[PDB]
Amino acid sequence: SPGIWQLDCTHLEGKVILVAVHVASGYIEAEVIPAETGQETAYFLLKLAGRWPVKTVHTDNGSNFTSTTVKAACWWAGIKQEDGIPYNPQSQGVIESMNKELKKIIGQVRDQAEHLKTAVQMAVFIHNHKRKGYSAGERIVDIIATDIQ
Amino acid sequence: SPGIWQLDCTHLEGKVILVAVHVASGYIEAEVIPAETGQETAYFLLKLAGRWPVKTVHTDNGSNFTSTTVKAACWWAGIKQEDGIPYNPQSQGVIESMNKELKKIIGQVRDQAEHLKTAVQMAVFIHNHKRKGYSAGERIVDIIATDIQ
């Protein structure tokens, strides 16, 4: 559970926003890419796993589950790649709500940024710092510190 | 001191590697860019501050310290922007040794990656997970969790 993340891919402005959610805290990292390829997904997971202790990734669709590039990054970084089948139907709901929240935030900041990539990083920052009480960024650090001790 | 980071810019392969170091832990984040501009530095700091609780950044040179785009990102993300004067001369030596270690790691992985940006992310991963005892990635989570508590 400290080590489990879920990938999620959403679209805006003709572009793709790739998101990784830390399931137990709701903390996220995200990037904008032109399209969702196994090479972009693989690089994104290499980045994530150098920054947090990623033990398991639930991939966002069958193409990234199948992709040998994605499997090669998960091998390199020590990540167990799994499917993203919502055996718990609560999962679909939580992701859909997160995409709608993020798109809302992105529209609230959208006029402060020329490029979408900026607005998306502003929305990561707002999402992770929002107190709902602790923020997601506080929860993920507490969860992992608890695990290390 | 849980909130204090230092920017560091190093060169390799005619390209620029921008690094942020969390001073109390040695944990790092890094990216490859074609050249160091205020806009690239500003975007990298927006990214860092959406991911960790960044209170103060010691800028890597006077042009990023002066840059109004870098100041606008620090204002946006709530970061106090400071100079990087090594009033402690040990600061100089710590950064030089970090750059030489990162470059060594990058040379050890360099033929597993077509692009330098992959090799740099592999080096971030190896650096942050290296046990020296705890890793940098363990230390930064412990430090921050202790602060939150």
């Binding site: 090479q39 693989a42 290499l46 040998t68 090669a72 | 990656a113 077509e114 992959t118």
Partner: peptide, 8 residues
């Protein structure tokens, strides 16, 4: 290309 980022 026989690389992690270019398996070709």
């Amino acid at each position: 290309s026989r690389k992690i980022d270019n398996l070709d």
